[PDB]
Amino acid sequence: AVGIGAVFLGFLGAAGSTMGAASMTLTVQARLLLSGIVQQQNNLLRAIEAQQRMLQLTVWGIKQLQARVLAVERYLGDQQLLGIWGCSGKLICTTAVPWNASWSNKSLDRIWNNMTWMEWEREIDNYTSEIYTLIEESQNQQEKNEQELLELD
Amino acid sequence: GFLGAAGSTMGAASMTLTVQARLLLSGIVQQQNNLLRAIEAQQRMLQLTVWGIKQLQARVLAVERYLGDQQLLGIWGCSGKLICTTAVPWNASWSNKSLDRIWNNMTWMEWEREIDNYTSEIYTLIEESQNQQEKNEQELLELD
């Protein structure tokens, strides 16, 4: 039989948590953007390797290849952005870009105390791309060019 | 194929980990693979064939391993660097052995045999202490 211990937070544990506290669970989310078969087991890995081998000649194996590649692309799709910005992780980082209130005026005492990440997310969906681009140019503009020039003697 | 250190103890091996530096492969191998990637056009025209299929799968696997290993270093706030530190007190519950014995007369691989049931937690405490907390503390300083 199997007995059980205790959290140790848990996957998506902060999903409904107030963002102020949920902000301290980032390790859990990040840990699992490449998984669902964690720990040796150690029969699960053996089985998966066995099916990855046996099924290499057929469509179902191909569909596993499809899924695996997808996972990797999604991962790197985020790592790319984190690399481009001066935010190599690090779970969090700050920019030089000033928050433009056009996006949202809401008070921080409302944000950090009574709102989930998803509620917050709904409100900034349409400004995501703009925000990214502004971070990007802020990263390059001066913070890298002038930086180079700050070592210019 | 950087396993030269396997014939030594952890002390000594620890002097050669930085000597290894140059990746275990990949890198220049990927540059050689670039030459092969050009060839892949021929191997495209080839059509679907066993070995070809295996190769595709082999590439996928290789890459998956690379990134999985790298991932944790990023999340840990250690990046790399081959040697980093983290503020996690070595809970003696895991092990209790003199450092002289841990580093000397201790094949690295052999050492792993006795750490395996604790490695999982150790990763957790690293995460949830080292980066979970410290990340905020820097921001918290920057708030003032």
Partner: antibody, heavy 134, light 112 residues
Framework: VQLVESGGGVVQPGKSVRLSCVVS????????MYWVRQAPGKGLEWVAA????????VYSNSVQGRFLVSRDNVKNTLYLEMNSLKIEDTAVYRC????????????????????????????WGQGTTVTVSS | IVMTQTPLSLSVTPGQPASISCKSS???????????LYWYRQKPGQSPQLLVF???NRFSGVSDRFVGSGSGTDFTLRISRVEAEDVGFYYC?????????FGGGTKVDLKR
Amino acid sequence: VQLVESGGGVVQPGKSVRLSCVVSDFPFSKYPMYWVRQAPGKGLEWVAAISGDAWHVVYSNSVQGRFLVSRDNVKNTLYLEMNSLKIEDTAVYRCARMFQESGPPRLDRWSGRNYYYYSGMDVWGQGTTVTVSS
Amino acid sequence: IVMTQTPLSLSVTPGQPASISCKSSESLRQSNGKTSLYWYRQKPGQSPQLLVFEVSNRFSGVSDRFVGSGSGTDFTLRISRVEAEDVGFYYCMQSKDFPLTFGGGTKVDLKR
């Protein structure tokens, strides 16, 4: 290995006892332990189980809330306290050691919550009897 | 999750083959890729003696005359050349999940 029980006898319903077990010849803190129960002229009944690190513990429904089992990993002993005994608790009680020793609770990193592994048994003590009624 | 045994009692002569059947109402496969079912015996005044564990893996200090096997929901023992010493009560125990449970209990004895 040495596995003996101590502190049996007879009591009235509503009374309580502290039935202990003393062991030797092994790394006690690495072996989860069992308490088993056999009523006179009847078959076996599992009662309770306690993990090697003495953190995890489970009971049978019929005893849950009345029995309390503890450990002393320094002195190599078990302590099965039984409160508010009922007449039907009259039985042979016995201390036993798990066959396959478990390591530390395997933690899975996907909300694993530290799992403990439990297996069979390989050493039964002699046993003693606790009799209940006025 | 219960478990039953047959025969209730079994009378066999020294050198005679014999068997013990224990059926589970529930699947016995464990998450480690093996089943969780053990057998053992005790004589009057004696305590259970692990006979075999994990079905086919008989215990150290136990004769090869003791064998057994079965499906993912039930298992049986077979004892070849039953010895005069092989009398007493036999049980099976499911450890697949809590609470731990036992088979009905069988009594092996001699016939004359």
